[PDB]
């Protein structure tokens, strides 16, 4: 093979804002006057940036010798992800992880006349589970052809350095892809309204807004660790409690700079105005309004299942093939506190959670459903209950009491709907639960 | 907008510079700060303003 | 410069026939030439300056 | 700019220098050979028919 290129211009993919040579030339002199005395300004500007493609250039004195290459430099970089501290151990066998949680019950008034006929009644405990699966299986494939690459180098050091650079790149790719997947986890969690949104804007003070975001974040962190617990900071609407030593906070570079400049510099004894939980800084979030994410240590459910490399050699083609196989499971637990701080426009209602997601009832039985509405504003909204079982005799009370007709065999879906859109363009937030029929 | 128009503009310019400098030196790197889009990282002792 | 690579999905059925397939690494090169070539000229008339 | 090592540069300069002496030797040989032809053409040169 003899690969050649002919008649390639020195500025291939350059879309200049303005012509520097023409601007210097036709300037009477207001800001470019310093470059007028320069003699080789045009020649310098012609090759100011590196040339994409090299072409053979004859010597100016004797137009028979060819100008040579004097210096060759090899650029090498090392990359890794800072979120490796959020990874748990390894799962050699098995595929699915099951997480179980139990909620609290409700108090009943002490009555003696009413306790005669229901000594043996049942009060089913509130429990709920979720499952995490193995969902990442990838490999990185790279070939090295040393015999063909030997012609591109003169010294024996550059060749080895180039091979080492390829070997380093085959690992840097996985190192950056793991970080990309972990960030995609948070982005996907926010993309479906599973985060509890806290608005940074609306200071409601008219005198000071620099400290509003830090005040709100400190208040949220303080109320996350209340001993009595709360149901307002998780997607399962279960009474849970968090600890300050287990609270992590992923913040943006802009947010970190704002904290460092606006408040920390002008604040004496900044120990009482800095952040509370552990702090990590990333490049930013792909979501429009995301600025910071405050989560719990047990929020991440990332595990590794396989990490290996295998090499093969083709002797007919005289090359090496490297395959780096990585298998991982990436998931996030819904039973942990997780809030997201936003500084834009958000819908009035984020999500609706029905307490029993999965239920089983008899033909003549009944069920009770409770709905929680995650509203960004302070005003409340009313829910509407519906059932899409498709059999007559089955109806749901407006308070959330589902009654099943005595003659039916179908899978019941119970929907709670909140209307937030304006008239003539309704917007609906729907949370539904599944019910099975026991004959 | 302007680094000399007002003290607020100067402060936000400083904030932007600090944010950019911090995100240039992250370990995972980025490909949105050079002419050729390649994943590369810088260092604080190597950055010059 | 060498700039990482792209990952592929695991597939034994395709690996059954693509064992020896080649994947060229992502390598980018650029070249810098010499462009500044000048001189400074000054004349001195010592006899006239005396 | 056409060389990487110095020794090649001095070798090229030495070849350029030696070219002058080679040309001088060749021209001297031609000039001295011209004398026989000139003397034979002028007819002052004894001849034997073969």
Swiss-Prot record, chain D:
It is found in: Virion. It comes from the Viruses. Homohexamer. Homopentamer. The prolate capsid is composed of pentamers and hexamers of the capsid protein. Belongs to the phi29likevirus major capsid protein family. Assembles to form a prolate capsid shell of about 54 nm in length and 45 nm in width, with a T=3, Q=5 symmetry. This is Major capsid protein. It comes from Bacillus phage phi29. The chain holds residues 151 to 200 of 448 of the full protein.
């Amino acid at each position: 093979m003899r690969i050649t290129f002919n008649d390639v211009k020195t500025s291939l993919g350059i879309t200049e804002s303005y012509d520097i040579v023409n601007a210097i030339r036709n300037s009477q002199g207001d800001n470019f006057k310093s470059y007028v005395p320069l003699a080789t300004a045009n020649n310098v500007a012609e090759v100011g940036a590196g040339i994409l493609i090299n072409q053979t250039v004859q010597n100016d004195f004797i137009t028979s010798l060819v100008d040579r290459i004097g210096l060759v430099v090899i650029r090498q970089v090392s990359l890794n992800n800072p979120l490796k501290k959020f990874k748990k151990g390894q799962i050699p066998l098995g595929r699915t992880i099951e997480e179980i949680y139990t909620d609290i019950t409700k108090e009943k008034q002490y009555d003696a006349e009413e306790a005669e006929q229901k000594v043996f009644e049942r009060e089913m405990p509130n429990v709920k589970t979720l499952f995490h699966e193995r969902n990442r299986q990838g490999f990185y494939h790279q070939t090295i052809q040393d015999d063909s690459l030997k012609t591109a180098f003169v010294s024996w050091g550059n060749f080895e350095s180039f091979v080492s650079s390829i070997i380093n790149a085959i690992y840097n790719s996985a190192e950056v892809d793991e970080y990309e997947y972990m960030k995609l986890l948070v982005d996907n969690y926010y993309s479906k309204g599973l985060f509890t949104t806290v608005k940074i804007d609306e200071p409601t003070s008219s005198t000071g807004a620099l400290t509003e975001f830090v005040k709100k974040m400190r208040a949220t962190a303080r109320k996350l660790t209340l001993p009595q617990g709360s149901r307002d900071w998780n997607s399962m609407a279960v009474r849970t409690r968090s600890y300050m030593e287990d609270l992590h906070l992923i913040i943006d570079a802009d947010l970190e700079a704002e904290l460092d400049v606006d408040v920390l510099a002008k604040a004496f004894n900044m120990n009482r105005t800095d952040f509370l939980g552990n702090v990590t800084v990333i490049d930013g979030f792909a979501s429009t309004g995301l600025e910071a994410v405050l989560v719990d240590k047990d929020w991440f459910m990332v595990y590794d299942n396989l990490h290996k490399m295998e090499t093969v050699r083709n002797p007919r083609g005289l090359y090496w093939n490297y395959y780096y196989h990585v298998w991982q499971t990436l998931s996030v637990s819904r039973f942990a506190n997780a809030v997201a701080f936003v500084s834009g426009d958000v819908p009035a209602v984020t999500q609706v959670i029905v307490s029993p997601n999965i239920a089983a009832v008899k033909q003549g039985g009944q069920q009770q459903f409770t709905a929680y509405v995650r509203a960004t504003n302070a005003k409340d909204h009313k829910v509407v209950w519906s059932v899409e079982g498709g059999s007559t005799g089955t109806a749901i009370t407006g308070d959330g009491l589902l009654s099943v007709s005595g003659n039916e065999d179908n899978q019941l879906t119970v929907k709670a709907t909140v209307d937030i859109g304006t008239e003539d363009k309704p917007k609906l937030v729907v949370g539904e639960a599944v019910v099975s029929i026991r004959p």
